[PDB]
Design a protein around this ligand. Sequence first.
Ligand SMILES: NC(=O)c1ccc[n+]([C@@H]2O[C@H](COP(=O)([O-])OP(=O)(O)OC[C@H]3O[C@@H](n4cnc5c(N)ncnc54)[C@H](O)[C@@H]3O)[C@@H](O)[C@H]2O)c1
Ligand SMILES: O=P(O)(O)OC[C@H]1O[C@@](O)(COP(=O)(O)O)[C@@H](O)[C@@H]1O
Ligand SMILES: O=P(O)(O)OC[C@H]1O[C@](O)(COP(=O)(O)O)[C@@H](O)[C@@H]1O
Lengths: 301, 310, 301, 312
Amino acid sequence: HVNKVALIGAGFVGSSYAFALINQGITDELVVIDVNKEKAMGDVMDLNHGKAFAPQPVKTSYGTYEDCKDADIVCICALELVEKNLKIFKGIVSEVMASGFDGIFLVATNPVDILTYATWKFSGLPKERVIGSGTTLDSARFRFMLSEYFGAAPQNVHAHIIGEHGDTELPVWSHANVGGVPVSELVEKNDAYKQEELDQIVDDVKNAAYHIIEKKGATYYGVAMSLARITKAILHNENSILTVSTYLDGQYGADDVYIGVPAVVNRGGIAGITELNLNEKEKEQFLHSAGVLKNILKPHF
Amino acid sequence: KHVNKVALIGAGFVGSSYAFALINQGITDELVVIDVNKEKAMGDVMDLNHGKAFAPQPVKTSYGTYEDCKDADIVCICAGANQKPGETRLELVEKNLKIFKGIVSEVMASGFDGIFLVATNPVDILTYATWKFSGLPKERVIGSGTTLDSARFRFMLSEYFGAAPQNVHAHIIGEHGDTELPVWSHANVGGVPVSELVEKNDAYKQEELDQIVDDVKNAAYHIIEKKGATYYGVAMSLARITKAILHNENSILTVSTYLDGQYGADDVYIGVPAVVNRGGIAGITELNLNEKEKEQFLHSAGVLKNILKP
Amino acid sequence: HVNKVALIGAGFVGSSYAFALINQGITDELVVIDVNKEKAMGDVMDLNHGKAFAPQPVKTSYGTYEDCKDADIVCICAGRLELVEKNLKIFKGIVSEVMASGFDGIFLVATNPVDILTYATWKFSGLPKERVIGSGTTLDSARFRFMLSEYFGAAPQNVHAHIIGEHGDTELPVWSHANVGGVPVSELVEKNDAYKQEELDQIVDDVKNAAYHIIEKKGATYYGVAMSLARITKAILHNENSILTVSTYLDGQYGADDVYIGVPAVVNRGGIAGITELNLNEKEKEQFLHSAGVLKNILKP
Amino acid sequence: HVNKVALIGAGFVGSSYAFALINQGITDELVVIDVNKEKAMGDVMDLNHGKAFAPQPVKTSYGTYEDCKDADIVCICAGANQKPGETRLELVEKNLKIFKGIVSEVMASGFDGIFLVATNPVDILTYATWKFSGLPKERVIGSGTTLDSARFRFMLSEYFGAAPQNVHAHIIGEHGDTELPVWSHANVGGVPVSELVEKNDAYKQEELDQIVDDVKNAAYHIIEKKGATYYGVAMSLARITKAILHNENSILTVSTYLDGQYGADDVYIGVPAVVNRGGIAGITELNLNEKEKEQFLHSAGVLKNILKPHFA
Ligand SMILES: NC(=O)c1ccc[n+]([C@@H]2O[C@H](COP(=O)([O-])OP(=O)(O)OC[C@H]3O[C@@H](n4cnc5c(N)ncnc54)[C@H](O)[C@@H]3O)[C@@H](O)[C@H]2O)c1
Ligand SMILES: O=P(O)(O)OC[C@H]1O[C@@](O)(COP(=O)(O)O)[C@@H](O)[C@@H]1O
Ligand SMILES: O=P(O)(O)OC[C@H]1O[C@](O)(COP(=O)(O)O)[C@@H](O)[C@@H]1O
């Protein structure tokens, strides 16, 4: 009867994701599902022990796929490691579908873009109901670094990373800005004394994953938060512009591929999609980026 | 300078969840993460800070050292060893007492003039030692105490009775540990005492609630076996205390607080209901414990004496 | 699909309530229905305008009865010779329409006499009694709790005390269970000095009077009720199981039945889900029979 | 030690402002100040009566000037409102005499926070709270064109189909008739609104002008409908307050002193600013086109005049 979210696989991401939910109050319900029943169950005990202090307390309980019949979102947090996740994914989607599930999919495990489309196959529901991290975290990583660079609130910083999530991302420097003044127009005062520091900031973003991963072993708080953000926009029908994994079909010259761009999100899922008036470099970059992703698909299917 | 700042010390699992909970709830305007292992701390600053753009309540999170505790409004200590499966408590205490020794000296040497918030286990004893080491008043040194254990009790009572954790009112008190006791005598669901509720079933209600108590004391053991540690509960718990503190709440929480005579106990840091606010402790909630409960509460504070003396 | 409340009556009360959700983000959407379009529309436009700068995006709109069809909650705050006979007439129609609208959710009444109109509401509706709820004594209990909080130096969230019976001037405190942090007020008056119990009865005399006192000063009372209604609505939409002293129907419970009266009750998505029956004392038992009498002798005609 | 806001003026705006805070938990303390002790004190009473059911319990008290000593923000909502028959300069005259006593008494109590003026016409009274008070310009802040902006964003969210947070479009100028959109930068999700009607020319590009003359007419409109406006300004005053209490470095079209910018100076007027615990941290200078240029200076021209009879 109320906002329910089934979350598949309680790893570091699924956990952090789950704890963000606890603290922000986005859903009323959460059920944690894992093969590692041990690691899930214990999660549902620790989390529930903060309930009496949660400003927006969630009913957190564990279960198995029989409980996702009514679930309104399933979040998925479960080299050639690809097919492994695929055996895992198809090994895991088939279970939820039989349950009675008729909601909207949400996925976060790398390689997200691949695994999103991979998820679109096994499922068989309108392409407006499968989603993935896309470049939100990278947009948010880009915002953060641009807020620290320009010294204005991140939310007052507007700049997308777009494309797939990996070795081929790109900045939309064109319509990037701070409070409605374009990034370009900001540097215009000092010829390259910004410019290249901002191009370095591009690399800090592209690299930040590896960096964090080198420092504390993995990455999880960030995606947890972006996860939570996408969720909110969905449950509470926001019509919010996020850079999720959206199925294009003509947009940015590409078709037959889940990619990260500015997609509107609401109760349904992907609602509209913004085609951005890009440019050669970025268009080419996106086009090329749209490239590698098309490849990796065919055979593994 | 003019705005709420939390210094966290020790970015293991515990402190990092506590920093994340804060990142999500927005209790403080600023958070400084310090830990001798620079790698993990600055590695954690980056990861939290990247969520910023999607966080509701705005927090500047940086890396810092002890000197940055200068204008901290609060220092939260979550650092120090875990109790290895062999050793005793007195043993762990020895080892954690030399950690807290180094830490507090530096904290104080920075110029810090705030409030201490202790997570390290056993937290009662280690709150006692922050008070003595630091020089500060017993009102400005607080440990999570039995807050977690009550929120734990609160929840289990909650689901078993079908009412919100917020509407269920019962304390676990004394020790964060094995000799902890429920104040059944004052407990209730919307004001209707629990003892009157169980009427409905004998050999069906009255001892399931005993299992519930059992489930609370050894909840920390059941969690560790099932994933490794425990951090999400102590996270909320700690966060609840910062909020109550930073927002000058005059809220009532069962933290570790200095008793000098209350409850039949003194010269000990123990868990009892306290009024928490901008200064720390402001008042002590004197329960009328029944026979069974005063007796148990004495065993609990004596045992904390068992370690404080040596 | 998403949380929807339909407020009927955009006076000072209905208008303040809307502002509370629009500030707390309790709901996803709200529709504002009033016998007066140029007031209700102004209200609607004044809210939505601050949407850009608000916590949770709430969508607000002007409308009429037909819009209730899918509302999870209709909240009614619409209202010399008899006040009661009038509003009875007014509810009969208001309720009449939303019944015929198809609306199959939950009624929340606020208009005074809140207990009678919740009784009447229920009468006109034919919905199960558990789905018909008045703001009961929850505004009284809250006033009582701010007051003891100012008295005992503890926070309102930690002062536990019920007002029960009719919302009005035969309302009674439940001292036998009033407590701060778990410690009874009885004990706390064993501290203090000269002046305890005497000033406590002033506090209780001030809770009967607060309405009368705010009106003397500002012609109407609206903030506190907004905050009451806003909290019941919360308990309902997010299914929290909240003990609140709403106006509710009685099964003999408390030695009186058939009436709608302010008592502690378990509120969730389904409505009322259990009456908390407290163990009253000699005094309390009788003050409560005299309240229930007066109320059930207003109904008869 | 804790966040304290002083509200001077418990009218429709003041009270609504207090109710937003009491529902949003942005301040820790609020004291309401008002020579009408009955109203002021009636609001404190009704607002406290909700305290138990607040998610972020605020502390509210009735007080007076002496209680602004430790306040972080003084919010002025005290003032007369314009009678249809009287000129704006008649309104100002009346309002400036109230401000001088208000701003004089606040200062003599030991206050040293940031002023935040809402009373109309805000920019004039902002300047006068500045002059009267002799504080740094950065710490006298006016409500500016923040609501005008907020409306300008609501209407544009309903016309373009995306969340008001996704919509970016400043109104700037004086908070009144001579204000103006900044179409040159306006943009949904980053894409310029020019690029959005590029597909749908003028049939659209006159719908927007309508959206603008309604932004420019919402005041009178709501004032004709529900009898008075106030919820909107409340959410603006709350947002600004929130950015200063929590040290946001957020951008808001607030009224500010410009020292040369936009060809204007010695004048408070509404432009985008960086706002924090110090007040105005910076002044957001956007590259305006020729038209936006011309309208801005003229709007500056109106304020300057009203100011002159006390410009010395
Ligand atoms: N964009 C990013 O930089 C970002 C950040 C962090 C993580 N991720 C992705 O999220 C994933 C999770 O990362 P993590 O740190 O939690 O690693 P993890 O292994 O600890 O978590 C994955 C969890 O999935 C669960 N799981 C594994 N196989 C399963 C199965 N077949 N059925 C059900 N559950 C199963 C396990 O409990 C495991 O803990 C990673 O694979 C990573 O690619 C992306
Ligand atoms: O629309 P974007 O660029 O994705 O940004 C979303 C964030 O931007 C905002 O700061 C709006 O930015 P502006 O007010 O500076 O135009 C917030 O409303 C929101 O959280
Ligand atoms: O968590 P605590 O410390 O037991 O207090 C929880 C609060 O919620 C309540 O259940 C609300 O109920 P009351 O109206 O009886 O006060 C109160 O008992 C108390 O004020």
